[PDB]
RNA sequence: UCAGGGUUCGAUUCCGGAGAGGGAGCCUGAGAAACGGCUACCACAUCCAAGGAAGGCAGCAGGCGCGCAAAUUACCCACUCCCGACCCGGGGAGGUAGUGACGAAAAAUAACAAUACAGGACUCUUUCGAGGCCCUGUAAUUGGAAUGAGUCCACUUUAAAUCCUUUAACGAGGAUCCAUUGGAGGGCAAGUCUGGUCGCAGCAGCCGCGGUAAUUCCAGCUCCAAUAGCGUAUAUUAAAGUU
């Protein structure tokens, strides 16, 4: 703590900037409920006990 | 105030009341994906008329037998029924429609009739071929993908008398690839 | 432990439900007229106002912040209200005596989450959104 | 390829003194048809003259060709002079609407309410 | 909105009533207590040469004020009808264009082959292994087609125009002819991934997160939901068998 703790937009004014690294555009439409489609009821790869959430980072 | 105009219109489909259900988001994926199918909304739209016939159905099942009004009302829904083949012709009674599914209906939309017919090497290939104008049902082009198409008219489907895909002249691109040997190898 | 089931009854059972009616408590509320009265708002869903200045409500015991409130004094009526500014650092683009349009807290009368005594926040600080100057998409305008 | 021209629900009116139809026109091609080549072919297939054929409101369906309107054939110019909207009739020259503005016409009006016996100032000074 | 019963709304385009700043009194007329008529009082307010004169947009546009809150001082009697001495005149009634994400219907934003890898059925091989039919990913150069958004000729449309429809001539390689709004502890679909802050800043409808190893804060990446829409405040209905 450094002069008035009770500072607005403290955390915020203080967050080293990140630059968005982004390129690829995303499909829209029908397309991207034809890849949803693809990436779980026929690209599918099955076992037993095993959890697989599509954002697992585990 | 006083204007020449109408106001009558209505929705044509309902939101499901459970928002975040995994069961019935992926049946309804599934059945998207299988129907190549933009929306869900497209889904909905098809479960709010079977809905609708099925209150019918039953809102003249519960009166008794050779009422006049059941009998004529009967016989028009299921007449209008088998019009667009999703009841067979020996069936035609009042008990079998509550036995209708949500892919009969899907079945017999023309993006599906297209590629079922074998106009179309996919689904998602008859879609862009019926919305660019490539499909004629007898005389008409359709420019729409849901078009429900009746019995009588399943012979006719084939493709538009001015278009590339039979008997058309060339689009822009066999147009420009072709002037490549006038104009862009030959002037340029 | 009764009630009267008979033919000709319909007088007693619509009186006693017309009566008892009144004893619950948002049919009470939305009928008498009291709080139509003391509700800040004329019953309207926003009011616009102005900053008296800013405050700093502290949070109740199991939580510790200062959240940052302002003192508004509403056009249409003259009341004075308690109303909240949330993001992280939207304090800084409200100055005193300017027009803010504030909104309701999402439970319809009643304090929100830890804060108290607080049942209104700022929604636009002068023409401009709240959520566009805290993405940059717009400015104040001096 | 070229147009062709069918007549529907044909009706002979002996009481405006004219023929009326509806027309449709078939086109497998490139345009819907100007209503100066319609009139050509109606001419030629009932045998009169191309000025006392009278057709309007042609629109095309989606998808292009066949494409469908209404049609009149006066007995006479006379007749046809007489009951023919004025505004069709401009349509080829037989008429001509003269006037201004419809603000001109009531500004001027209720100056001329103002003044009473001879009002020179508006029938000749504007 | 609703299983059955019910609950809430109806200033608002059709029928009926009432009013023309507030009251009051009348003329003409078949029909008025008429206000696009008259006469007074009250409240406002305009011009004056100060003697006098003139007023009623809750009609169509427009303006000030009020507010959280609602459009152009446009064109035309061509349609529908009304009035008249009348087949001919007139109509801010009405029709037409403009502003318009109130809200309702249709449905663009990528389709298809090759190669490379991956999976599955299969064939033999003791087995490895291999080939081969379908699909899906994925990257690369491709590879060729297909088309409407846009510019735009003529017709068509209409009172005259616009829009749509019909049509030429141009018009795509994905880096732009670039989809958003909310969220990822539970309710409730989706990450114990990486940096920053350290009971502060903030989040959080509710339970609850933050005190130096944060699944919830600030961001990056990834993922989930609906999608040309999505979030928020309030009124109200079902859930409420908590009337
Ligand atoms: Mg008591
Ligand atoms: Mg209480
Ligand atoms: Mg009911
Ligand atoms: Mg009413
Ligand atoms: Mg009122
Ligand atoms: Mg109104
Ligand atoms: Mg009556
Ligand atoms: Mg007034
Ligand atoms: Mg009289
Ligand atoms: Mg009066
Ligand atoms: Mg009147
Ligand atoms: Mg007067
Ligand atoms: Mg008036
Ligand atoms: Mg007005
Ligand atoms: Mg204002
Ligand atoms: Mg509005
Ligand atoms: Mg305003
Ligand atoms: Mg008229
Ligand atoms: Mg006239
Ligand atoms: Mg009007
Ligand atoms: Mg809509
Ligand atoms: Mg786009
Ligand atoms: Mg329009
Ligand atoms: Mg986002
Ligand atoms: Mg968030
Ligand atoms: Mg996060
Ligand atoms: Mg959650
Ligand atoms: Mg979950
Ligand atoms: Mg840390
Ligand atoms: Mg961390
Ligand atoms: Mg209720
Ligand atoms: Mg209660």
Same mark, same amino acid.
């Given at each position: 703590?450094?002069?008035?703790?009770?500072?607005?937009?403290?955390?915020?004014? #203080?967050?080293? $900037?990140?630059?968005? #690294?982004? $390129?690829?555009?995303?499909?829209?439409?029908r397309?991207?409920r034809?890849? #949803?489609?693809?990436?779980?009821?026929?690209?599918?790869?099955?076992?037993?006990?095993?959890?697989?959430?599509?954002?697992?980072?585990? | 105030?006083?204007?020449?105009?109408?106001?009558?219109?209505?929705?044509?489909?309902?939101?499901? /009341? /459970?928002?975040?259900? *995994?069961?019935?988001?992926?049946?309804?994926? *599934?059945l998207i994906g299988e129907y190549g199918l933009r929306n869900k909304?497209e889904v909905?739209?098809?479960?709010?008329?079977?809905?609708?016939?099925?209150?019918?159905?039953?809102?003249?099942?519960?009166?008794?037998?050779?009422?006049?009004?059941?009998?004529?009302?009967?016989?028009?829904? +299921?007449?209008?029924?088998?019009?667009?083949?999703?009841?067979?012709?020996?069936?035609? *009674?009042?008990?079998?429609?509550?036995? +209708?599914?949500?892919?009969?209906?899907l079945?017999?939309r023309?993006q599906?009739?297209?590629?079922?017919?074998?106009?179309?090497?996919?689904?998602?290939?008859?879609r862009?071929?019926?919305? &660019? /104008?490539?499909?004629?049902?007898?005389? &008409?082009?359709?420019?729409?993908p849901?078009?429900?198409?009746? +019995?009588?008219?399943?012979?006719?489907?084939?493709?538009?008398?001015?278009?590339?895909?039979?008997?058309?002249?060339?689009?822009?691109?066999?147009?420009?690839?072709?002037? *490549?040997?006038?104009?862009?190898?030959?002037?340029? | 432990?009764?009630?009267?089931?008979?033919?000709?009854?319909?007088?007693?059972?619509?009186?006693?439900?017309?009566?008892?009616?009144?004893?619950?408590?948002?049919?009470? %509320?939305?009928?008498?007229?009291?709080?139509?009265?003391?509700?800040?708002?004329?019953?309207?869903?926003?009011?616009?106002?102005?900053?008296?200045?800013?405050?700093?409500?502290?949070?109740?015991?199991?939580?510790?912040?200062?959240?940052?409130?302002?003192?508004?004094?509403?056009?249409?009526?003259?009341?004075?209200?308690?109303?909240?500014?949330?993001? =992280?650092?939207?304090?800084?683009?409200?100055?005193?005596? =300017?027009?803010?349009? !504030?909104?309701?807290?999402?439970? %319809?009368?009643?304090?929100?989450?830890?804060?108290?005594? !607080?049942?209104?926040?700022?929604?636009?600080?002068?023409? !401009?959104?709240?959520?566009?100057?805290?993405?940059?998409?717009?400015?104040?305008?001096? | 390829?070229?147009?062709?021209?069918?007549?529907?629900?044909?009706?002979?009116?002996?009481?405006?003194?004219?023929?009326?139809?509806?027309?449709?026109?078939?086109?497998?091609?490139?345009?819907?048809?100007?209503?100066?080549?319609?009139?050509?072919?109606?001419?030629?297939?009932?045998?009169?003259?191309?000025?006392?054929?009278?057709?309007?409101?042609?629109?095309?369906?989606?998808?292009?060709?066949?494409?469908?309107?209404?049609?009149?054939?006066?007995?006479?110019?006379?007749?046809? @002079? @007489?009951?023919?909207?004025?505004?069709?009739?401009?349509?080829?020259?037989?008429?001509?609407?003269?006037?201004?503005?419809?603000?001109?016409? @009531?500004?001027?009006?209720?100056?001329?309410? @103002?003044?009473?016996?001879?009002?020179?100032?508006?029938?000749?000074?504007?």
């Open positions: 703590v450094h002069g008035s703790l009770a500072r607005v937009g403290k955390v915020r004014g #203080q967050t080293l $900037k990140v630059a968005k #690294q982004e $390129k690829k555009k995303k499909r829209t439409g397309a991207k034809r890849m #949803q489609y693809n990436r779980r009821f026929v690209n599918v790869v099955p076992t037993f006990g095993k959890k697989k959430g599509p954002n697992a980072n585990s | 105030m006083p204007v020449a105009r109408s106001w009558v219109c209505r929705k044509t489909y309902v939101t499901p /009341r /459970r928002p975040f259900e *995994k069961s019935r988001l992926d049946q309804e994926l *599934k909304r909905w739209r098809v479960k709010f008329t079977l809905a609708k016939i099925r209150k019918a159905a039953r809102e003249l099942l519960t009166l008794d037998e050779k009422d006049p009004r059941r009998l004529f009302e009967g016989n028009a829904l +299921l007449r209008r029924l088998v019009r667009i083949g999703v009841l067979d012709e020996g069936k035609m *009674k009042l008990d079998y429609i509550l036995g +209708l599914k949500i892919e009969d209906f079945e017999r023309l599906t009739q297209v590629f079922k017919l074998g106009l179309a090497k996919s689904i998602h290939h008859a862009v071929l019926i919305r &660019q /104008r490539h499909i004629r049902v007898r005389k &008409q082009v359709v420019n729409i849901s078009f429900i198409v009746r +019995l009588d008219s399943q012979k006719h489907i084939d493709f538009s008398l001015r278009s590339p895909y039979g008997g058309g002249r060339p689009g822009r691109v066999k147009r420009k690839n072709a002037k *490549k040997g006038q104009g862009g190898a030959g002037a340029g | 432990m009764g009630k009267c089931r008979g033919l000709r009854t319909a007088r007693k059972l619509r009186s006693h439900r017309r009566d008892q009616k009144w004893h619950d408590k948002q049919y009470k %509320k939305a009928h008498l007229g009291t709080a139509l009265k003391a509700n800040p708002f004329g019953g309207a869903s926003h009011a616009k106002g102005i900053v008296l200045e800013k405050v700093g409500v502290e949070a109740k015991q199991p939580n510790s912040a200062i959240r940052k409130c302002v003192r508004v004094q509403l056009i249409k009526n003259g009341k004075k209200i308690t109303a909240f500014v949330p993001n =992280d650092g939207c304090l800084n683009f409200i100055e005193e005596n =300017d027009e803010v349009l !504030v909104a309701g807290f999402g439970r %319809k009368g009643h304090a929100v989450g830890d804060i108290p005594g !607080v049942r209104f926040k700022v929604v636009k600080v002068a023409n !401009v959104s709240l959520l566009a100057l805290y993405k940059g998409k717009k400015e104040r305008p001096r | 390829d070229t147009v062709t021209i069918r007549t529907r629900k044909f009706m002979t009116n002996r009481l405006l003194q004219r023929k009326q139809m509806v027309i449709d026109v078939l086109h497998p091609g490139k345009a819907t048809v100007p209503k100066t080549e319609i009139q050509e072919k109606l001419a030629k297939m009932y045998k009169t003259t191309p000025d006392v054929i009278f057709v309007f409101g042609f629109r095309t369906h989606f998808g292009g060709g066949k494409t469908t309107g209404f049609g009149m054939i006066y007995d006479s110019l006379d007749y046809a @002079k @007489k009951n023919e909207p004025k505004h069709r009739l401009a349509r080829h020259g037989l008429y001509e609407k003269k006037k201004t503005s419809r603000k001109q016409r @009531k500004e001027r009006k209720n100056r001329m309410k @103002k003044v009473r016996g001879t009002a020179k100032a508006n029938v000749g000074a504007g």
